[PDB]
Amino acid sequence: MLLPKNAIQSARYFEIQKIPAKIAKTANEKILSVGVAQKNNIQPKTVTAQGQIGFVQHPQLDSSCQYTQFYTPQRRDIRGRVARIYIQDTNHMHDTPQIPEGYKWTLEFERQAQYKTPWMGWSFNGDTFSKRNHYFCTLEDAISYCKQMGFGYEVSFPRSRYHTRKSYADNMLWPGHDNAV
Amino acid sequence: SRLAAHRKNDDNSDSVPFEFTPENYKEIEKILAKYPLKQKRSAVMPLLYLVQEQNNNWVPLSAMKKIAKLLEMPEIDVYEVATFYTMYNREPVGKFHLQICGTTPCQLCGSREITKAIEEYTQTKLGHTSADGKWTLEEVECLGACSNAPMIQVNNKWV
Amino acid sequence: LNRMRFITAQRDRSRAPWQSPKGEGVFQGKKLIVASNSPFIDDMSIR
Amino acid sequence: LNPYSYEALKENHWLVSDSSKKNSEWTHKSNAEQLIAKVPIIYVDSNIVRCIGGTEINAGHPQVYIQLDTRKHGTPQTCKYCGLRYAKKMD
Amino acid sequence: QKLIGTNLRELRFVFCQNSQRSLGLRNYIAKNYWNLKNQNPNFPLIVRECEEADPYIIARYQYGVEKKAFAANNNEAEIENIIKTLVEQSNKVN
Amino acid sequence: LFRGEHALRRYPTGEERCIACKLCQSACPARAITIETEPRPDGSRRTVRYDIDMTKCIYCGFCQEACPVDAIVEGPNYEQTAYLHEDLFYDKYKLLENGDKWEPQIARNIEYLINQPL
Amino acid sequence: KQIEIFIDGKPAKVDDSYTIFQACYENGVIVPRFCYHERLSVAGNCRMCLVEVENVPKPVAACASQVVPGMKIKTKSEKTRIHRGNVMEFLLANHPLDCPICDQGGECDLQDISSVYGYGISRYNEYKRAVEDKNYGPLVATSMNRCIHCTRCVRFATQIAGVEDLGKTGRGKAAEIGTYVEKTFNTELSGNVVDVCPVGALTNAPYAFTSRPWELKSFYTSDVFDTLGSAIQVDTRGPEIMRVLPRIHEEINEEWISDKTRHAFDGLKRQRINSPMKRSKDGNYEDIFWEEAIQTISKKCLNTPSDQIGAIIGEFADIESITALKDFLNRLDVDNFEVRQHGNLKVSPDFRANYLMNSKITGVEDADVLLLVGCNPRYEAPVLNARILKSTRKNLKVFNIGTNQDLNYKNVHLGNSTKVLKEIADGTHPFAERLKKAKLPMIMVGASALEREDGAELYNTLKVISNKTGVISEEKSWNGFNILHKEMGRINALELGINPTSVNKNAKLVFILGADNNLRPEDIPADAFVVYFGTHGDEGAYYADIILPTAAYTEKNATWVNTEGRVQQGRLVVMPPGDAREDWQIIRALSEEAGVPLPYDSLEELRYRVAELAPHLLKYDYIEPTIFGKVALSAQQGVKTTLSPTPITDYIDNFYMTDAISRASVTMAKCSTAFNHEKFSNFKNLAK
Amino acid sequence: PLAAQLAINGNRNAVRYENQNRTWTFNELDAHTNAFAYGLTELGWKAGDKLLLWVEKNHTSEITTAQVGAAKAGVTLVPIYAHSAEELEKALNDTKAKGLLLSPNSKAGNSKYIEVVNKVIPELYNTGRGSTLKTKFANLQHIIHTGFYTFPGTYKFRQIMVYASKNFNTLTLPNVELNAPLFISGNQTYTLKDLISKTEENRKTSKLNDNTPVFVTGDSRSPLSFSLGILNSLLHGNYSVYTGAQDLNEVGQTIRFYDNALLLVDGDIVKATQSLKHSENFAKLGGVAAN
Ligand code: SF4
Ligand code: SF4
Ligand code: SF4
Ligand code: SF4
Ligand code: FES
Ligand code: FES
Ligand SMILES: [Zn+2]
Task: Write a three-state SS string for G560-575.
Answer: EECCCCCEEEECCCCC
With residue G196 as reference, give the H or E element that holds it: helix G191-196
Among A residues 20-39, those touching chain G with beta carbons less than 8 Å apart: 26, 28-29, 31-32, 34-36, 38-39
Contact (CB<8Å) D35/F14: yes
Chains contacting chain B through 3 or more C-beta pairs under 8 A: A, D, G, H
G213 lines ligand 3 (CB under 6 A): no
Cross-chain Cβ contact G342/H129 below 8 Å: yes
Q: Give nearest CA residue, ligand 5 atom 4.
A: B142
Please tell me the distance from the alpha carbon of residue H102 to that of residue H114, in angstroms, as a whole number: 8
**Residue of B99, B100, B104, B106 best suited for mutating to test ligand 5, as the one with most atoms within 8 Å of CB:** B106
Distance of CA G509 to the CA centre of its chain: 35
Give the residue from H82, H122, H80 showing the smallest Cα distance to H101: H80
D71–B contact, CB cutoff 8 A? yes
Instruction: Confirm or reject contact between C43 and chain D (CB < 8 A).
Output: yes
Beta bridge partners of D88: D44
For B63, E83, G335, G609, the CA distances from E89, given in Å and listed in that order, are 84, 10, 20, 24
- Closest ligand to C-alpha of residue D83 is 7
**Residue G268 DSSP SS3:** helix
Query: Which is nearest to B16 in space by CA: B62, B68, B50?
Result: B62
What is the H94 CA–ligand 3 centroid distance (Å)?
A: 71
* Cβ–Cβ gap E33/G631 under 8 Å: yes
From A69, A57, A77, A71, select the one nearest A16 (Cα to Cα).
A57
Q: Is G61 in the pocket of ligand 4 (CB under 6 A)?
A: no
Q: CB of G108 closer than 6 A to ligand 3?
A: yes
- Preceding omega of F117 cis (within 30 degrees of 0): no
Ramachandran sector of residue G657 (left: φ over 0; alpha: ψ -120 to 50; beta: rest): beta
Cβ proximity of G312 and G512 under 8 Å? yes
Resolution for this model in angstroms, one decimal place? 2.9
CA torsion sign, G462 to G464 to G469 to G474? positive
CA–CA distance, H210 with H200 (Å, rounded to integer): 12
Q: Verify whether ligand 4 is closer than 6 Å to residue G139 (CB atom).
A: no
* Residue B15 CB-half CA count within 13 A: 20
* Contact present, G91 and G110 (Cβ < 8 Å): yes
Which member of E12, E49, E58 has the closest CB to residue G627? Answer: E49
Instruction: Determine the Cα–Cα distance for residues D81 and D64; give it in Å rounded to an integer.
Output: 9
What technique solved it? cryo-EM
Rounded to 5 degrees, φ, ψ at G460 are -65, -40
First vs last Cα of chain E: how many Å apart? 18
- Which residues sit with Cβ closer than 5 angstroms to ligand 7, an ion? D 51, 53, 79, 81-82
**Is F67 annotated as belonging to a binding site?**
yes
CB H20 within 8 A of CB H41: no
Cα separation, G266 vs D15, whole angstroms:
16
Q: Which of G124, G160, G547, G96 is nearest to G382 (CA)?
A: G160
Question: Is the minimum distance from the CB of F46 to ligand 2 under 6 angstroms?
Answer: no
Q: Does ligand 2 lie within 6 Å of residue F27's CB atom?
A: no
CB atoms within 10 A of CB B66: 23
Residues composing chain H: 291
- Beta-carbon-side half-sphere exposure of residue H96 (alpha carbons within 13 Å): 4
Crossing angle (nearest 10°) for helices G109-116 and G78-92: 140
Chains interfacing with F (3 or more CB pairs < 8 Å): A, D, G
DSSP G606-662: HHHHHHHH-GGGGSBTB----S-HHHHHPPPSS------SS----S-S-TT-SSHHH
B109 is in an annotated binding site: no
Q: Dihedral sign, CA of G288, G289, G293, G298?
A: negative
Closest Cβ–Cβ partner in A55, A89, A166 for G248:
A89
Query: What is the spatial distance between Cα A100 and Cα B80, in angstroms, rounded to a whole number?
Result: 38
Q: Residues near G609 by Cβ (< 8 Å), separated by ≥ 6?
A: A32, A35, G323, G327, G598, G599, G600
Q: Which chain F residues are within 8 Å of D4, Cβ to Cβ?
A: none
Nearest Cα residue to D85 out of D39, D50, D47? D39
d(CA G72, CA G54): 5
Q: Which atom of ligand 2 is nearest to the CA of F66?
A: 3
Nearest alpha carbon, ligand 4 atom 7: G147
Interface contact B79-G182, CB threshold 8 A: no
Contact residues for D62 (Cβ-Cβ < 8 A; gap 6+) = D52, D81, F68, F69, G97, G98, G100
H147 and C CB contact within 8 Å:
yes
CB–CB of G604 and A93 under 8 A? no
Q: Which atom of ligand 2 is nearest to the CA of F8?
A: 1
- How does DSSP assign H137-192, residue by residue? SS---EEEE-SSS--TT-EEHHHH-----SSS-----PPP-TTSEEEEETTEEEEH
A119/F51 CB distance under 8 A = no
Coil, helix or strand at residue A91? coil
Please tell me whether G375 is known to bind a ligand: no
Judge whether F106 is annotated as a binding position. Answer: no
Instruction: From chain F, pick out residues whose CB is under 8 angstroms from the CB of G215.
Output: 22, 25-26
Tell me if chain A has a CB within 8 Å of the CB of E52: yes
* Interchain touch G–B (≥3 Cβ pairs closer than 8 Å): yes
Strands G472-473 and A134-136: unpaired
Find out whether B34 and B52 touch, Cβ atoms under 8 Å.
Answer: no
G197 touches ligand 4 (CB under 6 Å): yes
> How far is the centre of ligand 6, averaged over its atoms, from the C-alpha of G670 (Å)?
37
Q: Are D79 and D64 in contact (CB under 8 A)?
A: yes
Q: How far is CA D85 from the centre of its chain?
A: 4
For residue G114, the ligand 3 atom closest to its alpha carbon is 7
Q: In angstroms, rounded to a whole number, what is the distance separating the alpha carbons of residues B100 and B117?
A: 12
Which ligand gives the minimal distance to the CA of G192? 4
Residues 6+ apart with CB under 8 A from G324: G583, G584, G587, G588, G591, G598, G600, G606
- Residue G94 CA to ligand 4 center (angstroms) comes to 15
- In angstroms, how far apart are the furthest CA atoms of chain E? 36
Cα–Cα distance, G483 to G144 (Å, whole number): 43
